[PDB]
From Swiss-Prot:
Annotated source species: Homo sapiens
Matches recorded under InterPro entries: Na/ntran_symport, Na/ntran_symport_taurine, SNS_sf
Name of the molecule in the record: Sodium- and chloride-dependent taurine transporter
Reactions catalysed, as given in the entry: 4-aminobutanoate(out) + chloride(out) + 2 Na(+)(out) = 4-aminobutanoate(in) + chloride(in) + 2 Na(+)(in); taurine(out) + chloride(out) + 2 Na(+)(out) = taurine(in) + chloride(in) + 2 Na(+)(in); beta-alanine(out) + chloride(out) + 2 Na(+)(out) = beta-alanine(in) + chloride(in) + 2 Na(+)(in); hypotaurine(out) + chloride(out) + 2 Na(+)(out) = hypotaurine(in) + chloride(in) + 2 Na(+)(in)
Disease cited in the entry: Hypotaurinemic retinal degeneration and cardiomyopathy: An autosomal recessive disorder characterized by low plasma taurine, childhood-onset progressive retinal degeneration, and cardiomyopathy.
Origin organism lineage: Eukaryota, Metazoa, Chordata, Craniata, Vertebrata
Function: Mediates sodium- and chloride-dependent transport of taurine. Mediates transport of beta-alanine. Can also mediate transport of hypotaurine and gamma-aminobutyric acid (GABA).
Predominant place of localization: membrane
Length: 548
């Protein structure tokens, strides 16, 4: 009883809104800046064609073929490896804990954009240290934008073990954003009709304005050269490779179960290969273009301040809140452009959060529809999920919560855990289920036989990349650091590893549970649990599909 997407363009708009946003405008520039700039692009493209796009198309095709969500699809494909879907759910849950927190910051910035002069312009406020000097007079000192970010918005603490006191303004902003998300999920309100145009054209318009500004700012050539020219010796450490791979996985929202759910509503006879390739190219181009503006702004800041490009802003989640607000003040009438930019960022983040939360709730209600999907029960479950997520995200709202966010940025919904899922999604498909059988299914669905690119990416390239990155990250281990200076304690790293393992351990525990449930000799149990249970039976009669 899976609902169709009705209009073809509706699915394209929904996925485009889902898989673009803070991952392209916020996470990508900060990860590129943290990893030296140009050297980050070489793995990024390697994980872009070898994996990422093949994995995204694999998830979409699995959703369209099984006509099931993020959990039942693996039940139909390979019952033994069903826990992968569960793992995906856990991952998305962790994302909903922290991915919305960024919006709160943006909301705060929006509330700071309704005054005559932007607060991040001069060193004369009450939160400015004596070492605050205007960048025009900088010819050690700290930029007013950085001080506003890390002393007014955040009020950063000396460490994660110093939570301080909860910030009521950021807590109220997060509560308002969560209320907006809850109302959107409950009432079903979403971009419909002409609004979708403003939902689609506006985010790509304002960025273009930034592309006009950053390019024309003096000293942007140095920033562009830093962003494009790679450092060879920077590729010898696994950090850049794993960051690029996880950024590729994060931007495409794969290994979360949302893409499979979105592809489930697609019609069985629908050429989703071309659409998936076009959307992936659009997402990659958006990230690449936004990087140009970000690094041109950073180069201008480096030229005006006289410090090196690698030491102009925060090498962390707050890079987008130090660079773009700086470029806003350069444009005439900075208040209007700041309001527009933060509205665009809030819209992108809200669309991504809507898609992810709705997918998670759909997966949860589909897992056990009994006593959960009865009308008001679904509303109560949505309210409970939103309240639990807000209470969990309140830990990153305190003065010393930024460090916590970094952990959720590094281990939760990112890092080796994604490499844990992307491998197991491929190995089951490529070797257990069979690459040729899935190719026959795709030929039956889209109408033409695909090339060997997807088969060779599922069979070899993606598993090899995932296992190599995991092994090299373990062998050459470097503890997580915040802004290249702060060193997390042992317990913080243990908490981050526990957050990663909460999703990584779903796959092996479900295997043991399935083996214990089945009765008989071990070989018979494994053979029974490795047999797909009619993957296309849902659409066998709906579209006259060929049985598996
Ligand atoms: Cl990206
Ligand atoms: Na979006």
């Amino acid at each position: 009883q899976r609902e169709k997407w009705s209009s073809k363009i509706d699915f394209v708009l929904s996925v485009a809104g889902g898989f673009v946003g803070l991952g392209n405008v916020w996470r990508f520039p900060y990860l590129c800046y943290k990893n030296g700039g140009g050297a980050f692009l070489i793995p990024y493209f390697i994980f872009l064609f070898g994996s990422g796009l093949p994995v995204f198309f694999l998830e979409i095709i699995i959703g369209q073929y099984t006509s099931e969500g993020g959990i039942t699809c693996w039940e139909k494909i390979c019952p033994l490896f069903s826990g992968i879907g569960y793992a995906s759910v856990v991952i998305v849950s962790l994302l909903n804990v922290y991915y919305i927190v960024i919006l709160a910051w943006a909301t705060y910035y929006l509330f700071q954009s309704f005054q005559k002069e932007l607060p991040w312009a001069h060193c004369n406020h009450s939160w400015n240290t004596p070492h605050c000097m205007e960048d025009t007079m900088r010819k050690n000192f700290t930029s007013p934008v950085i001080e506003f970010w890390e002393r007014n918005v955040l009020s950063l603490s000396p460490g994660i073990d110093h939570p301080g006191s909860l910030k009521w303004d950021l807590a109220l902003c997060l509560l308002l954003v969560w209320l907006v998300c809850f109302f959107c999920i409950w009432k079903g309100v979403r971009s419909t009709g002409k609004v979708v145009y403003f939902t689609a054209t506006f985010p790509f318009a304002m960025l273009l304005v930034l592309l006009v500004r950053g390019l024309t700012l003096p000293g942007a050539g140095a920033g562009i050269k830093f962003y494009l020219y790679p450092d060879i010796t920077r590729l010898e450490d696994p950090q850049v490779w794993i960051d690029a791979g996880t950024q590729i996985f994060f931007s495409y929202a794969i290994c979360l179960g949302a893409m499979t759910s979105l592809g489930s509503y697609n019609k069985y006879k629908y050429n989703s290969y071309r659409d998936c390739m076009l959307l992936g190219c659009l997402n990659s181009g958006t990230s690449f273009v936004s990087g140009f503006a970000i690094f041109s702004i950073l180069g201008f800041m480096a030229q005006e301040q006289g410090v090196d490009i690698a030491d102009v802003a925060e090498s962390g989640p707050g890079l987008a809140f130090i660079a773009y607000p700086k470029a806003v003040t350069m444009m005439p009438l900075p208040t209007f452009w700041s309001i527009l930019f933060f509205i665009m960022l809030l819209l992108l983040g809200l669309d991504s959060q809507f898609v992810e939360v709705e997918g998670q709730i759909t997966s949860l209600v589909d897992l056990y529809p009994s006593f959960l999907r009865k009308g008001y029960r679904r509303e109560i479950f949505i309210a409970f999920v939103c309240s639990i997520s807000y209470l969990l995200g309140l830990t990153m709202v305190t003065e010393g919560g930024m460090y916590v966010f970094q952990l959720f940025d590094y281990y939760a919904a990112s890092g080796v855990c994604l490499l844990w899922v992307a491998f197991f999604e491929c190995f089951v498909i490529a070797w257990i289920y069979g690459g040729d059988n899935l190719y026959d299914g795709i030929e039956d669905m889209i109408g033409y036989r695909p090339g060997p690119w997807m088969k060779y990416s599922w069979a070899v390239i993606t598993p090899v990349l995932c296992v190599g990155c995991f092994i090299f990250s373990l062998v050459k281990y470097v503890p997580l650091t915040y802004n290249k200076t702060y060193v997390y304690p042992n317990w913080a790293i243990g908490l981050g590893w526990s957050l990663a393992l909460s999703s990584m351990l779903c796959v092996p525990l479900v295997i043991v549970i399935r083996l214990c449930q089945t009765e008989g000799p071990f070989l018979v149990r494994v053979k029974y649990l490795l047999t797909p249970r009619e993957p296309n039976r849902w659409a066998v009669e709906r579209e006259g599909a060929t049985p598996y």
